Write a new protein. Structure first.
Lengths: 92, 92
């Protein structure tokens, strides 16, 4: 089975709905990261009330330092959220 | 629904099975990228017979230039594969 076919499809929907919420048509704006953290990753990621973490997360994820998260690094954000929930249960 | 819960779970399985195939326990080695492209992304991504593209993809994905793809950029790879299948259908 292509487990990756589930993710690629599950994200293109949440990626385009948010990245496409505003901007040209495929770029992530803070109003999505903070809104996506409180709306999507709100069951696994605490709903930040201050973009502050979103200000720090961008410092760890923003590679071009654009203050925004294109699709290449935006995914890398879920990976940073997915990695914490993966190393935690596997805490040797 | 947390569509992202599907991806995070769908990847932790393919991410740990490959990233955990060899190495410490959570790092991606070429033997996974080329093997993951021919085994997982083989229905959407052509099965490369030459790591050559994997040699070029790493040049576009490897940020630390480690010749390997940690979990933060490894995900960014699927995003580069997911983005091509997302902008193609949305080719205005
Ligand atoms: Ca946007
Ligand atoms: Ca960015
Ligand atoms: Ca590995
Ligand atoms: Ca790297
Ligand atoms: Zn789009
Ligand atoms: Zn692991």
């Amino acid at each position: 089975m292509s487990e990756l076919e589930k993710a690629m499809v599950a994200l293109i929907d949440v990626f385009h709905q948010y990245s496409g919420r505003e901007g040209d048509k495929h770029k992530l704006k803070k109003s999505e990261l903070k809104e996506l953290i409180n709306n999507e990753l709100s069951h696994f990621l605490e709903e930040i009330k201050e973009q502050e973490v979103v200000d720090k997360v961008m410092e760890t994820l923003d590679e071009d330092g654009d203050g925004e998260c294109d699709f290449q690094e935006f995914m890398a954000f879920v990976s940073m959220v997915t990695t914490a929930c993966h190393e935690f249960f596997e805490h040797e």
